[PDB]
Protein backbone atom coordinates (compact mmCIF):
# COMPACT_ATOMS: atom_id res chain seq x y z
CA UNK A 1 0.00 0.00 0.00
CA UNK A 2 0.92 3.82 -0.39
CA UNK A 3 2.92 4.95 2.29
CA UNK A 4 1.67 8.09 4.26
CA UNK A 5 5.08 9.61 4.17
CA UNK A 6 5.96 13.37 5.55
CA UNK A 7 3.72 14.90 7.96
CA UNK A 8 0.08 13.50 8.22
CA UNK A 9 0.23 13.19 12.04
CA UNK A 10 -2.51 11.87 14.30
CA UNK A 11 -3.69 15.13 15.76
CA UNK A 12 -4.07 16.44 12.24
CA UNK A 13 -6.07 13.06 11.66
CA UNK A 14 -8.11 13.63 15.23
CA UNK A 15 -9.29 17.23 14.19
CA UNK A 16 -10.46 16.39 10.93
CA UNK A 17 -12.73 13.26 13.05
CA UNK A 18 -14.11 16.27 15.02
CA UNK A 19 -14.91 18.65 12.13
CA UNK A 20 -16.59 16.46 9.92
CA UNK A 21 -18.16 14.39 12.67
CA UNK A 22 -21.52 16.69 12.59
CA UNK A 23 -21.24 17.01 8.44
CA UNK A 24 -22.31 13.82 7.32
CA UNK A 25 -22.67 9.97 7.81
CA UNK A 26 -22.12 7.78 4.71
CA UNK A 27 -17.93 7.62 4.86
CA UNK A 28 -16.48 6.33 7.71
CA UNK A 29 -14.56 8.93 9.24
CA UNK A 30 -11.43 6.28 9.78
CA UNK A 31 -7.91 6.78 10.55
CA UNK A 32 -6.99 5.08 7.18
CA UNK A 33 -8.49 6.53 5.40
CA UNK A 34 -7.95 10.26 6.75
CA UNK A 35 -4.24 9.51 6.28
CA UNK A 36 -4.73 9.40 2.44
CA UNK A 37 -8.05 9.13 1.01
CA UNK A 38 -9.27 8.35 -2.35
CA UNK A 39 -11.08 10.19 -5.12
CA UNK A 40 -14.19 8.20 -4.23
CA UNK A 41 -14.11 9.06 -0.75
CA UNK A 42 -13.37 13.22 -0.72
CA UNK A 43 -16.29 12.86 -3.81
CA UNK A 44 -18.75 11.13 -1.53
CA UNK A 45 -17.89 13.66 1.20
CA UNK A 46 -17.91 16.78 -1.64
CA UNK A 47 -21.28 15.08 -2.73
CA UNK A 48 -23.02 14.22 0.48
CA UNK A 49 -22.12 17.50 1.85
CA UNK A 50 -24.69 19.55 -0.18
CA UNK A 51 -27.48 16.94 0.77
CA UNK A 52 -27.15 16.99 4.32
CA UNK A 53 -26.00 19.90 5.26
CA UNK A 54 -26.26 22.46 1.82
CA UNK A 55 -22.80 23.73 2.03
CA UNK A 56 -21.88 24.55 -1.58
CA UNK A 57 -25.43 23.58 -2.77
CA UNK A 58 -25.58 24.62 -6.56
CA UNK A 59 -21.65 24.17 -7.42
CA UNK A 60 -22.03 21.15 -9.00
CA UNK A 61 -23.99 20.52 -12.56
CA UNK A 62 -26.11 16.82 -12.68
CA UNK A 63 -23.10 15.59 -14.58
CA UNK A 64 -20.50 16.64 -11.76
CA UNK A 65 -21.85 15.18 -8.80
CA UNK A 66 -21.32 11.45 -10.31
CA UNK A 67 -18.09 10.03 -9.98
CA UNK A 68 -18.37 7.75 -13.36
CA UNK A 69 -18.26 11.12 -15.18
CA UNK A 70 -15.45 12.35 -12.87
CA UNK A 71 -13.34 9.51 -14.15
CA UNK A 72 -10.60 11.65 -16.06
CA UNK A 73 -7.54 12.73 -13.73
CA UNK A 74 -8.24 16.46 -15.43
CA UNK A 75 -12.06 16.32 -14.39
CA UNK A 76 -11.09 14.98 -10.60
CA UNK A 77 -8.69 18.00 -10.09
CA UNK A 78 -11.64 20.10 -12.10
CA UNK A 79 -13.92 18.69 -9.62
CA UNK A 80 -12.04 18.91 -6.21
CA UNK A 81 -10.66 22.75 -7.77
CA UNK A 82 -14.18 23.86 -7.57
CA UNK A 83 -14.60 22.88 -3.79
CA UNK A 84 -11.50 24.60 -3.06
CA UNK A 85 -12.20 27.48 -4.34
CA UNK A 86 -15.57 27.87 -2.54
CA UNK A 87 -14.16 26.70 0.94
CA UNK A 88 -11.62 29.44 0.79
CA UNK A 89 -13.86 32.29 0.04
CA UNK A 90 -16.58 31.18 2.33
CA UNK A 91 -14.28 30.26 5.63
CA UNK A 92 -11.57 32.86 4.67
CA UNK A 93 -9.14 30.89 5.42
CA UNK A 94 -5.67 29.74 3.28
CA UNK A 95 -5.53 26.36 1.54
CA UNK A 96 -2.04 24.64 -0.03
CA UNK A 97 -4.12 21.35 -0.21
CA UNK A 98 -3.57 21.18 -4.81
CA UNK A 99 -6.08 19.37 -6.44
CA UNK A 100 -3.12 18.00 -8.25
CA UNK A 101 -1.26 16.36 -5.13
CA UNK A 102 -4.72 15.23 -3.71
CA UNK A 103 -5.70 13.37 -6.72
CA UNK A 104 -1.50 12.35 -7.09
CA UNK A 105 -1.78 11.02 -3.38
CA UNK A 106 0.60 13.40 -1.90
CA UNK A 107 -0.13 16.13 1.20
CA UNK A 108 -2.47 14.55 2.93
CA UNK A 109 -2.25 16.79 6.45
CA UNK A 110 -3.49 19.43 3.13
CA UNK A 111 -6.24 17.41 2.23
CA UNK A 112 -7.38 16.69 5.74
CA UNK A 113 -7.04 20.62 6.21
CA UNK A 114 -9.77 20.94 3.18
CA UNK A 115 -12.16 18.36 5.56
CA UNK A 116 -11.16 20.67 8.56
CA UNK A 117 -12.33 23.81 6.65
CA UNK A 118 -15.38 22.07 4.95
CA UNK A 119 -15.69 21.01 8.43
CA UNK A 120 -15.78 24.70 9.89
CA UNK A 121 -18.31 25.70 7.38
CA UNK A 122 -21.09 23.05 7.88
CA UNK A 123 -20.86 23.61 11.81
CA UNK A 124 -21.44 27.83 11.21
CA UNK A 125 -24.14 26.34 8.71
CA UNK A 126 -22.98 28.70 5.97
CA UNK A 127 -25.11 28.83 2.60
CA UNK A 128 -22.07 29.51 0.39
CA UNK A 129 -24.36 31.36 -2.48
CA UNK A 130 -21.94 34.45 -3.52
CA UNK A 131 -18.87 32.27 -3.31
CA UNK A 132 -20.48 29.27 -5.43
CA UNK A 133 -21.76 31.87 -7.80
CA UNK A 134 -18.18 33.28 -8.04
CA UNK A 135 -16.64 29.60 -8.99
CA UNK A 136 -19.77 29.00 -11.04
CA UNK A 137 -19.36 33.03 -12.86
CA UNK A 138 -15.22 31.52 -13.50
CA UNK A 139 -16.56 28.40 -15.99
CA UNK A 140 -15.47 28.59 -19.56
Known amino acids: GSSGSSGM ?4 VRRTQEALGKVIRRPPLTEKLLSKP ?3 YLHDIITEVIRMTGFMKGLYTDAEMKSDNVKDKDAKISFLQKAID ?3 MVSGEPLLAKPARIVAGHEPERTNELLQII ?3 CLNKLSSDDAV ?8
Open 9 to 12: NAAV
Open 38 to 40: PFR
Open 86 to 88: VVV
Open 119 to 121: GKC
Open 133 to 140: RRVLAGEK
